[PDB]
């Protein structure tokens, strides 16, 4: 809860999630997996902090895009939008 700016970044991913959520309407595995994919990445950052410093993360945008790319097989379009948030994959 700090001084944020330009809600385009947030709204961008937000509306993007809608495409995904809608596209994978009958795919709870995709929506759940996709979130866990990102969360796996975010958690590892947290992990390093909890360890005190002597801990390297077990994920990167590479793991994120990796698992996501599997979900968006016949929907390469949604994937194109994804990379705009993370280009390290």
């Amino acid at each position: 809860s700090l001084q944020n700016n330009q809600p385009v970044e947030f709204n961008h991913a937000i509306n993007y999630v809608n495409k995904i959520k809608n596209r994978f309407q009958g795919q709870p595995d995709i929506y759940k997996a996709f979130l866990e994919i990102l969360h796996t990445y975010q958690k590892e950052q947290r992990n390093a902090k909890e360890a005190g410093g002597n801990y390297t993360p077990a994920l990167t945008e590479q793991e994120v895009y990796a698992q996501v790319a599997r979900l968006f097989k016949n929907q390469e379009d949604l994937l194109s939008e994804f990379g705009q948030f993370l280009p390290d994959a």
Partner: peptide, 16 residues
């Protein structure tokens, strides 16, 4: 970083 978490939080919101 905001990126992923910024987008993840979205789902929880769009879900409702």
């Amino acid at each position: 970083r905001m990126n992923i978490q910024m987008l993840l939080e979205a789902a929880d919101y769009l879900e409702r």
